[PDB]
Amino acid sequence: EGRMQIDEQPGNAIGAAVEGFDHATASDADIDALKSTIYTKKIAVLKGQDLSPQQFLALGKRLGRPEAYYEPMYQHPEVTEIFVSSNVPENGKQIGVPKTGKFWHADYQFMPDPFGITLIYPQVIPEKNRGTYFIDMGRAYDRLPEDLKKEISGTYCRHSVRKYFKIRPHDVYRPISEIIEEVERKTPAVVQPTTFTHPMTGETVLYISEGFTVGIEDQDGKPLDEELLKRLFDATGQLDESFEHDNIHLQSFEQGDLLVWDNRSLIHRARHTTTPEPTVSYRVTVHDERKLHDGI
Template sequence: MIITPQRGAKMGVEVSELDALAAPEEELSDLKNLVYTSKILVLKGQDLSPADYVEFGRRLGEVETYYQPMYHHPEHKEIFVSSNKKEGGMQIGVPKTGKFWHHDYSFMPRPFGLTLIYPQVIPQGQRGTLFIDLEKAYEQLPAKLRKEMADSWVVNSVRRYFKIRPSDVYRPVSEILAEIEEETPEVRHPAVFPHPVTGRPVLYISEAVSHRLEDAEGNPLRDGLLTEVLEAVGQLDTSFTHDNIHLQSFEQGDLLMWDNRSLVHRALHTPNPEPTVSHRVTVHDDHEFYPGIERQLTAAGR
């Protein structure tokens, strides 16, 4: 395994000569420790079948299957498919995913630590994924905002960016909304928590699903605070020129792996989209997502 910093990038390293299926456990442990400090790993020269890809995810931890079947790979439900291509006249996966700043699964009671993306069909023009490191961004917040965010909680919900499914056509909107609330009710997570590996505070809010800040007792914090913090860290910058924003490019054979606790991300969509297909596998790692979450889940009977 050879590790090389990405030239001229705000974060991330390239990892070459890694055999995803045959690498010894010690090497995989080193790989996971590396992602927590470097944030993004670009595993070069990978040639994995869908089954191999899922197996690699299992070597890293517990693979999470996405809760909505319309995103599933037809043969391996553990793979989330983002695609604007049709196969045999049928849509496989979902187009135009991730068009907003988000952490994966932050709208669920038990988020996961690692996200893996394996591009399959890559546009020839502008391509990539945008990232913000919310460990670093939190440290750079004005002291006043850090003080207001300390010990706060965020309420997250998928309702803003829920994608209508083929089965929802002709259904009453009220019925769809009621199902969304029943299937994915809003969840409450600490808005700032210590990273289980680095120990540094992580700001855990996103433009996509965070809609309310509260104190520990559930009382709302001041109006405008959430918007002010999102703007300060770069999530409301529609020009994508904020100093915190990193554009991660990729090429055929790259497999991206990143720290889903500290990074928010969004897809780079262009006005004239080219064919694109990407496979995602998501993994619960060896660490509690944040201190106390397992106790919360147990108390809630989850």
């Protein structure tokens, strides 16, 4: 219908708030405007969302084609397409996986065909130590020194989940070498251009993350020294354990908020566990009408 209102942050400031959005009744033009906001303001916060797990998936389906997480221990017991980050037991049982994403990453960056849009529906929000950190890697690329842009021009990076693969209940008593090899078979390292062109905005995106990017190689596929990756992590703010770097944005939320963000441009990371406050979050990840980049 006609009372969804989008309030974009002024200028080049990241973020936008969306009032009066109803996924069941929003028009085609509403969805078109919401997606444009996601690609340009990078983070759209839908306000006043009171959804069941099934309704959350229905909302995600308005934006794109959902993909379920490839490791099923993360999946919601009713809705396979919902990724559950939770350290609150439900009737004594562990739902989803606790303490996820404690590292800089873009979602499915270790996979050959990553999705363009991530949706997060916080269920239990810490009172004090709430929020998620973000870095716009297109803005971060633009702010690099010109020579550093030159150095990565024409290079490729390898992305792998081999550092942050989480042990599963059925992995107990297995030799660790056998899990390490299984991960390399199941999810081999993915080669991508170090930078790619955003299909929706045309921006140049620096598609690296401290958590998943394990190597960089030249225009001929010969590995380059990892010091280059360290200098790129350092320049974009990914090594600042104080989180005060100018590139870093802390996105807070309140009950009823639903975060929808550009999974091409942004990397993100959970806060330090400086308090014992718990986190429960539902995630839906959808493919939109373009691949992550033209080379996929």
